[PDB]
Design an enzyme around this catalytic site. Structure first.
Site, PDB file in Angstrom:
ATOM      1  N   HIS A  30       0.655  -0.821   0.104  1.00  0.00           N
ATOM      2  CA  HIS A  30       0.170   0.057  -0.204  1.00  0.00           C
ATOM      3  C   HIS A  30       1.038   1.462   0.094  1.00  0.00           C
ATOM      4  O   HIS A  30       0.458   2.517  -0.072  1.00  0.00           O
ATOM      5  CB  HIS A  30      -1.251  -0.066   0.867  1.00  0.00           C
ATOM      6  CG  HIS A  30      -0.434   0.831   2.026  1.00  0.00           C
ATOM      7  ND1 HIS A  30       0.362  -0.052   3.371  1.00  0.00           N
ATOM      8  CD2 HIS A  30      -1.225   1.287   3.039  1.00  0.00           C
ATOM      9  CE1 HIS A  30       0.071   0.390   3.673  1.00  0.00           C
ATOM     10  NE2 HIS A  30      -1.062   1.575   4.257  1.00  0.00           N
TER      11      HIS A  30
ATOM     12  N   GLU B  87      19.885   6.701   8.361  1.00  0.00           N
ATOM     13  CA  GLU B  87      19.052   8.120   8.867  1.00  0.00           C
ATOM     14  C   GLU B  87      17.689   8.244  10.196  1.00  0.00           C
ATOM     15  O   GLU B  87      17.838   6.687  10.738  1.00  0.00           O
ATOM     16  CB  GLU B  87      17.008   8.139   7.441  1.00  0.00           C
ATOM     17  CG  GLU B  87      16.591   9.713   7.786  1.00  0.00           C
ATOM     18  CD  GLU B  87      16.495  10.941   7.422  1.00  0.00           C
ATOM     19  OE1 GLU B  87      17.564  11.000   8.787  1.00  0.00           O
ATOM     20  OE2 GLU B  87      16.802  11.705   6.772  1.00  0.00           O
TER      21      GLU B  87
ATOM     22  N   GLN C 283      17.052  17.127   9.487  1.00  0.00           N
ATOM     23  CA  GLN C 283      18.378  17.549  10.050  1.00  0.00           C
ATOM     24  C   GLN C 283      19.750  16.434   9.743  1.00  0.00           C
ATOM     25  O   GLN C 283      19.007  15.133   9.386  1.00  0.00           O
ATOM     26  CB  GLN C 283      18.888  17.436  11.083  1.00  0.00           C
ATOM     27  CG  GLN C 283      17.978  19.457  12.025  1.00  0.00           C
ATOM     28  CD  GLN C 283      18.748  19.143  13.272  1.00  0.00           C
ATOM     29  OE1 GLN C 283      17.838  19.642  13.624  1.00  0.00           O
ATOM     30  NE2 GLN C 283      19.902  18.431  13.850  1.00  0.00           N
TER      31      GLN C 283
ATOM     32  N   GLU D 143      23.877   9.384   6.549  1.00  0.00           N
ATOM     33  CA  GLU D 143      22.614   9.321   5.210  1.00  0.00           C
ATOM     34  C   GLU D 143      22.556   8.911   3.962  1.00  0.00           C
ATOM     35  O   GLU D 143      24.084   8.990   3.664  1.00  0.00           O
ATOM     36  CB  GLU D 143      21.154  10.774   5.355  1.00  0.00           C
ATOM     37  CG  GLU D 143      21.045  10.937   6.459  1.00  0.00           C
ATOM     38  CD  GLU D 143      21.814  12.264   6.832  1.00  0.00           C
ATOM     39  OE1 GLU D 143      22.941  12.512   6.817  1.00  0.00           O
ATOM     40  OE2 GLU D 143      21.093  12.771   8.049  1.00  0.00           O
TER      41      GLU D 143
ATOM     42  N   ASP E 118      -0.063  -7.339   2.076  1.00  0.00           N
ATOM     43  CA  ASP E 118       0.538  -6.005   2.106  1.00  0.00           C
ATOM     44  C   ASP E 118       1.762  -6.176   2.007  1.00  0.00           C
ATOM     45  O   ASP E 118       2.514  -6.079   3.678  1.00  0.00           O
ATOM     46  CB  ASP E 118      -0.605  -5.162   3.031  1.00  0.00           C
ATOM     47  CG  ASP E 118      -0.249  -3.920   3.316  1.00  0.00           C
ATOM     48  OD1 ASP E 118       0.485  -3.355   2.006  1.00  0.00           O
ATOM     49  OD2 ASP E 118      -0.673  -2.907   3.813  1.00  0.00           O
TER      50      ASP E 118
ATOM     51  N   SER F 161       3.590   2.891   8.765  1.00  0.00           N
ATOM     52  CA  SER F 161       3.639   1.755   8.205  1.00  0.00           C
ATOM     53  C   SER F 161       4.500   0.754   6.571  1.00  0.00           C
ATOM     54  O   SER F 161       5.073   2.142   6.382  1.00  0.00           O
ATOM     55  CB  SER F 161       1.747   1.323   7.646  1.00  0.00           C
ATOM     56  OG  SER F 161       1.262   2.136   7.772  1.00  0.00           O
ATOM     57  N   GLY F 162       4.688  -0.146   6.990  1.00  0.00           N
ATOM     58  CA  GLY F 162       5.696  -0.035   5.723  1.00  0.00           C
ATOM     59  C   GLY F 162       7.271  -0.560   6.947  1.00  0.00           C
ATOM     60  O   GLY F 162       7.986  -1.437   6.411  1.00  0.00           O
TER      61      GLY F 162
END
Ligand SMILES: *C(=O)c1cc(N)ccc1[C@H](*)C(=O)OCCBr
Ligand SMILES: [Ca+2]
Length: 240
Positions: free
Chosen positions: A45, A59, A64, A69, A93, A188-189
């Site tokens: 989704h 991250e 910032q 990163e 999902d 989510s995910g």
């Protein structure tokens, strides 16, 4: 994450931020898990819309520069064949993303450990949800990675009428429901880290919460049971 605590900078190196180009800037949309140097696992989704996506590894603070990163673009999106937009309660999902290039592994960037196929956690298992999602229902995204202790709720209980009822299936994992801690929009995910045999493993992918709110008593956060997609996951990576 609702009612969570700020996470240590190197606690969950497998966590990633999934973002999409918004006008002239990027915006966090979902969480995800680095399963491969060039593969990320997230919620189907999450990539339903046809936008441009990028993955941010190492991250910590969204707004910032953390000096850790790593920005990588998405080359190929492989959603689950049985996935259907209009039916989240149906399951499936889950989506796999192939990254443009391989990320450099270090203290802030590591591969998530997957559970063995068919693995079911016992009731009240020790788990943690991570993400930059909303800190409050209808609130705003968190600036720094948040974490919340979310013990699991077994299928038998979660599938009970007082809980999620039939909305939930055996191919999902329930966690939380204390009315204080939970996943929220933007989480989510993302991963659900569970301690098994002294080691933390990604047992779920943040799928959904109640329409009523993020933190609702007897409405645990719903995750896609990763251990149900082991075969699939391996088949996708091997073929792509
Ligand atoms: C979680 O992946 C997530 C993140 C965002 N930004 C929007 C939706 C979703 C999953 C979901 O089913 O929630 C619907 C939005 Br009320
Ligand atoms: Ca940053």
């Amino acid at each position: 994450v609702v009612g969570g605590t700020e996470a240590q900078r190197n606690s969950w190196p497998s966590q990633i931020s999934l973002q999409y180009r918004s006008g002239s800037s990027w915006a966090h949309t979902c969480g995800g898990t680095l399963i491969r140097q060039n593969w990320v696992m997230t919620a189907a989704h999450c990539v339903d819309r046809e936008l441009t996506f990028r993955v941010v590894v190492g991250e910590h603070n969204l707004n910032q520069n953390n000096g850790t990163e790593q920005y990588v673009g998405v080359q190929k999106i492989v959603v689950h064949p049985y996935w259907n937009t209009d039916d989240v309660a149906a399951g499936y999902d889950i989506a796999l993303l192939r990254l443009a290039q391989s990320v450099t592994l270090n203290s802030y960037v590591q591969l998530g450990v997957l559970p063995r196929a068919g693995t079911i956690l016992a009731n009240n298992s020790p788990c943690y949800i991570t993400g930059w999602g909303l800190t409050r229902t209808n609130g705003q995204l968190a600036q720094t990675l948040q974490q919340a202790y979310l013990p699991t709720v077994d299928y038998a209980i979660c599938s009970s009428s007082s809980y999620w009822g039939s909305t939930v299936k055996n191919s999902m994992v329930c966690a939380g429901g204390d009315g204080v801690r939970s996943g929220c929009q933007g989480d989510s995910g993302g991963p659900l880290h569970c301690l098994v045999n002294g080691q933390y493993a990604v047992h779920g992918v943040t799928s959904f919460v109640s329409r009523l709110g993020c933190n609702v008593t007897r409405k645990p956060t719903v995750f896609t049971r990763v251990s149900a997609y082991i075969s699939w996951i391996n088949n996708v990576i091997a073929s792509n």
